[PDB]
Design an enzyme around this catalytic site. Structure first.
Site, PDB file in Angstrom:
ATOM      1  N   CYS A 116       0.830  -1.309  -0.022  1.00 31.29           N
ATOM      2  CA  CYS A 116       0.076  -0.172  -0.103  1.00 31.29           C
ATOM      3  C   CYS A 116       0.839   1.292   0.043  1.00 31.29           C
ATOM      4  CB  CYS A 116      -1.035   0.045   1.180  1.00 31.29           C
ATOM      5  SG  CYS A 116      -1.702   1.564   1.481  1.00 31.29           S
ATOM      6  N   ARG A 144       0.289   4.601   2.847  1.00 33.20           N
ATOM      7  CA  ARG A 144       0.666   4.526   4.330  1.00 33.20           C
ATOM      8  C   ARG A 144       0.878   5.583   5.142  1.00 33.20           C
ATOM      9  NH1 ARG A 144       4.238  -0.554   4.611  1.00 33.20           N
ATOM     10  NH2 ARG A 144       4.434  -0.010   2.273  1.00 33.20           N
ATOM     11  N   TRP A 194      -9.159   6.250   0.033  1.00 36.84           N
ATOM     12  CA  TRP A 194      -9.523   7.026  -0.854  1.00 36.84           C
ATOM     13  C   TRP A 194      -8.773   6.601  -2.330  1.00 36.84           C
ATOM     14  CZ3 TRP A 194      -7.986   9.769   3.234  1.00 36.84           C
ATOM     15  CH2 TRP A 194      -6.699  10.475   3.261  1.00 36.84           C
ATOM     16  N   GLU A 202      -5.952   3.878 -10.293  1.00 42.96           N
ATOM     17  CA  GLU A 202      -6.649   2.680  -9.798  1.00 42.96           C
ATOM     18  C   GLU A 202      -7.909   2.733 -10.797  1.00 42.96           C
ATOM     19  OE1 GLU A 202      -6.706   1.410  -5.516  1.00 42.96           O
ATOM     20  OE2 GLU A 202      -6.432   3.721  -5.303  1.00 42.96           O
TER      21      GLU A 202
END
Ligand code: HEM
Ligand code: HEM
Ligand SMILES: Cc1cc(N)nc2cc(-c3ccc(CCN)cc3)ccc12
Ligand SMILES: Cc1cc(N)nc2cc(-c3ccc(CCN)cc3)ccc12
Ligand SMILES: C[C@H](O)[C@H](O)[C@H]1CNc2nc(N)[nH]c(=O)c2N1
Ligand SMILES: C[C@H](O)[C@H](O)[C@H]1CNc2nc(N)[nH]c(=O)c2N1
Ligand SMILES: [Zn+2]
Lengths: 415, 410
Positions: B108, B111, B280, B285
């Protein structure tokens, strides 16, 4: 390790089975508890008699297995002759057939190379009779002329004598045979290619008189038999170059950009059967992104995104406007256009990644695997719209292989 | 031993000591790296050491290691694993564990936000209706009229494995995909199977291109049940382009809230099979993977056409040009409707900053380069040139089997 490892392609659902990883030879750097996959690099220490024996046998066995003569009289005799020779000379010499096989297979085994569908089509130049830097210069010129072929590029490798005691190494001090000089300015700026500042400075100390331009082809700095290295100018007519223009933007030519046609890396080490070829320049042809994304748009390289974005009149105040992304595409369009227009071999990242997937599948099916470094195979732009992004890969080290080696100015004993 | 990572753009070198604390496996061996494999392959006895390690790091985190409170907690935990074959986390522990599963999530890039996470304790939940209520509250909270807020809702832990709580959806909000009679696919092809399962369970499909799927919720191992998320809770963004006026005519839209609902949260040996969490979006993506994957909405061709590009040869880079324009539109559209979103340039700078923070205060940051580098324009983002070390720390988020492969229906 288990006998079978499976990889999956998440776009096509194709599953491949790897058994070749069982022939893995060296450490990856990874362990059970950590993965070093994004780490870029994870003297007279030459192979002892004892260390050399099994490494030689392993290679010889592999060679005879490849020519379908495993266990043959010729195989057994070659084994014995290699052993005798290691025993009395602490080293041995490869047959020309073995040298060619070894070179091709180091390429075939090179996990970071997306171009390996080509691996069996490699012109091998045997330069183990070379004794001097002038001789190295002759061999390299012939290599460059052959590989360039007036734009119809042919992949090739020139192999100089192997290491003996570590004090007599042949080395090409250049990182590639053809690269542009970089000059640090008093004001902190850089003229030319910042990647090559260190080596440029070395050339200048050795006596090179620099034109001090933006695209000055560097001299060859050539070390034979462990002597001090010597400077040579590559004849300019042997250096094929391409002016970069854009099919739509007429102003793109006004940037005055060009690049050279032939990528020929010269600082790697070739290992075959425990023998070490410290000078083995090899060349193929470019994937466009190598020039268009890295060489041009890396911050610490030519870094032309800004100037291109400006001429395109993009909003350069918000990152979220993606002005960098837009300019990056046009630059790579221009590079591919300019090479194709001048009939100089080049491949785009779509075509190359598609070929590599076909290659990898064929290797899995006929060789039982294909070591591949995802971090390097996926192109530096548009990663996920190329087929390799969704391809699971296994990475491991097979021999013969190409290896990194220290920069020679850090180890060389000046005479 | 201490390990170094180097950024090749800035020459900054960091030193990793934190990797010494991991004991889960990565998948690699000394001879084979599995860095790009997506999924590399309790009892009283197994549980207490795991519980012990977790409590130890919790009390170490609040600087009360070895305290009376610490000692007593260990004993309380030990007695409870004895008498019940499991144990329950304190609220503070639950919150600490959820935040740290995020902090430890090597894949991720978001972070830097890890300590700003709203944790919803749903461990008193018993039925699919209750799950629905908790999830509606989660969505309403996290959406916050466009000012998105990170959150996680944690349902009861696994007991005997026969009574699992599962959200069958892979995300709380997703669009249906329909296998067309002529062969092709309407809507999102990633969701065709799940969509069929909803229909098979009684869902009446509108058969549009952006139909929000119903929630399919399983409590205590029982058959799952269908629920419709109230529409006013589902925030969506019409995708338009700041220069191409025809782009809106493509009819595209997407939802503002990314809320993955099919992972497992592990804390001190306990397993939470239902733990939807949300943040969010990073623009890519949606704009790269969701719209331009071959096996997703696959819209590059249509866009490239409207841009009047030469699509006869790959080396025109028509795909690359269309890709950038789509992602410009996605970012522009969220920003114009004031829905939180981050572009891949800003997100990756923040991650590099986060790494530096973590190496300083924590002695490292586990990171998966393969997942951290964006799916477009990789090397012009600063994470491309950043060496990373991947290793698995606990608490963590893990993958789990899709429930329809295991569930014995009733
Ligand atoms: C014929 C066309 C070829 C193409 C299109 C090609 C493509 C590439 C590309 C794009 C890379 C990554 C380079 C970078 O990002 O800097 C690479 C790496 C590499 N290639 Fe190939 N290559 C070709 C030929 C060859 C040949 C002939 C050899 C050796 C005989 C070779 C061996 C290697 C090795 C060892 C690397 C890794 C370099 C490193 O780790 O520093 N390639 N190749
Ligand atoms: C706040 C804004 C956040 C942003 C911008 C963000 C960004 C991202 C992105 C771009 C990915 C790659 C996903 C993919 O390619 O499929 C990812 C993965 C992931 N994120 Fe974050 N994230 C955020 C918040 C969170 C939160 C709140 C959690 C959990 C509490 C979380 C946990 C994870 C995990 C576990 C993965 C990897 C999942 C997998 O392995 O498939 N993230 N994130
Ligand atoms: C043989 C060949 C062909 C090609 N198209 N590119 C290469 C690129 C390289 C290469 C170039 C530069 C570097 C330095 C780090 N990017 C590392 C490897 C080596 C050989 C290549
Ligand atoms: C919490 C969070 C925020 C965000 N912006 N994206 C996520 C994306 C994911 C994710 C989405 C899809 C997949 C499947 C493979 N792309 C795997 C993970 C999970 C969580 C996310
Ligand atoms: C940090 C990272 O390992 C490093 O930047 C690598 C990533 N992948 C790469 N891939 C290629 N083809 N060439 C490179 O120089 C790099 N650089
Ligand atoms: C094969 C490969 O591991 C797979 O396509 C991964 C690559 N990297 C990724 N990175 C992110 N962020 N998201 C993904 O889904 C993937 N997919
Ligand atoms: Zn690894």
């Amino acid at each position: 390790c288990p006998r079978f490892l499976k990889v999956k392609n998440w776009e096509t659902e194709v599953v491949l089975t790897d058994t070749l990883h069982l022939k893995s030879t060296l450490e990856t750097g990874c362990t059970e508890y950590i993965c070093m996959g994004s780490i870029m690099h994870p003297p007279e220490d030459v192979a002892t008699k004892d260390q050399l024996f099994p490494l030689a046998k392993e290679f010889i066995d592999q060679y005879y297995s490849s020519i379908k003569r495993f266990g043959s009289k010729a195989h057994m005799e070659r084994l014995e002759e290699v052993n005798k020779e290691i025993d009395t000379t602490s080293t041995y010499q490869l047959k020309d057939t073995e040298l060619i096989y070894g070179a091709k297979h180091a390429w075939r085994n090179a996990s970071r190379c997306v171009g390996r569908i080509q691996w069996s089509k490699l012109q091998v130049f045997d330069a183990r009779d070379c004794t001097t830097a002038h001789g190295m210069f002759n061999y390299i010129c012939n290599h460059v002329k052959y590989a360039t072929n007036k734009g119809n590029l042919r992949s090739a490798i020139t192999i100089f004598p192997q290491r003996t005691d570590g004090k007599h190494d042949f080395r090409v001090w250049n990182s590639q045979l053809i690269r542009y000089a970089g000059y640090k300015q008093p004001d902190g700026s850089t003229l030319g290619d910042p990647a090559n500042v260190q080596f440029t400075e070395i050339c200048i100390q050795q006596g090179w008189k620099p034109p001090r331009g933006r695209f000055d082809v560097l001299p060859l700095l050539l070390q034979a038999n462990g002597n001090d290295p010597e400077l040579f100018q590559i004849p300019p007519e042997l250096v094929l170059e391409v002016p970069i223009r854009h099919p739509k933007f007429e102003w793109f030519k006004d940037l005055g950009l060009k690049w050279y046609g032939l990528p020929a890396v010269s600082n790697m080490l070739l290992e075959i059967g425990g023998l070490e070829f410290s000078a083995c320049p090899f060349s193929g042809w470019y994937m466009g992104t190598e020039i268009g994304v890295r060489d041009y748009c890396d911050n610490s390289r030519y870094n032309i995104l800004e100037e291109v974005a400006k001429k395109m009149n993009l909003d350069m105040r918000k990152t979220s406007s993606l002005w960098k992304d837009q300019a990056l595409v046009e630059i790579n369009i221009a590079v591919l256009y300019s090479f194709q227009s001048d009939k100089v071999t080049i491949v785009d990242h779509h075509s190359a990644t598609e070929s590599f997937i076909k290659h990898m599948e064929n290797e899995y099916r006929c060789r039982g695997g294909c070591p591949a470094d995802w971090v390097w195979i996926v192109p530096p732009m548009s990663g996920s719209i190329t087929p390799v992004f969704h391809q699971e890969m296994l990475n491991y080290r097979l021999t013969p292989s190409f290896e990194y080696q220290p920069d020679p100015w850090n180890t060389h004993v000046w005479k």
